[PDB]
């Protein structure tokens with residue numbers, strides 16, 4: 419289940435695999451929001467295939483509409499938007515990504531990261547290949563380096579290598595409206611848990 423314009427269509431494992439073969443790397447942005455972060459990402463890295471996942475199709479309408487245009491007028495070919503929720507990822511995404519990403523999640527995806535939820539998180543790891551990079555940027559440090567958290571994450575397939583506390587400046591490289599509200603909002607701490615699956 420993917421987004422063509424503001425339309426919902428069907429993509430097979432078949433067609434996905436072809437599209438993918440034309441790119442050196444595949445990247446998943448779970449909880450992608452409005453596609454702006456991905457769009458920026460895709461425009462600069464034409465050798466990475468990008469997949470954004472979000473169950474809320476309406477926030478993607480504008481960019482989904484934009485990526486579908488001609489390349490002369492804003493179109494892109496390295497971007498697909500999947501409409502699925504973290505608690506039921508499509509089978510066609512197993513063992514597919516070189517790097518997975520969960521940026522600024524909220525509601526339940528925030529909790530699945532923070533708690534963490536071993537079962538759901540494990541499905542996210544399942545979307546990843548051999549030694550695929552990962553990245554988790556939450557925001558509301560010592561909690562993330564705890565042993566209970568680090569080992570709750572291993573258990574799911576997520577091996578922590580680095581854990582930085584970040585600030586507003588870091589968030590300026592992102593394009594979503596949400597990320598801008600936070601970048602130029604009040605001073606705040608953003609947390610980044612990166613590593614290999």
Ligand SMILES: C[S@@+](CC[C@H](N)C(=O)[O-])C[C@H]1O[C@@H](n2cnc3c(N)ncnc32)[C@H](O)[C@@H]1O
Pocket residue numbers: 448449450451452455471472473474477502503504505520521522523524525526527528594595596597
């Ligand atoms: C703050 S917006 C994310 C913004 C985008 N990731 C960014 O960094 O700008 C929160 C997003 O998380 C998504 N979300 C919350 N729970 C989710 C879940 N369980 N599975 C997938 N997406 C989820 C919502 O759909 C929403 O689009």
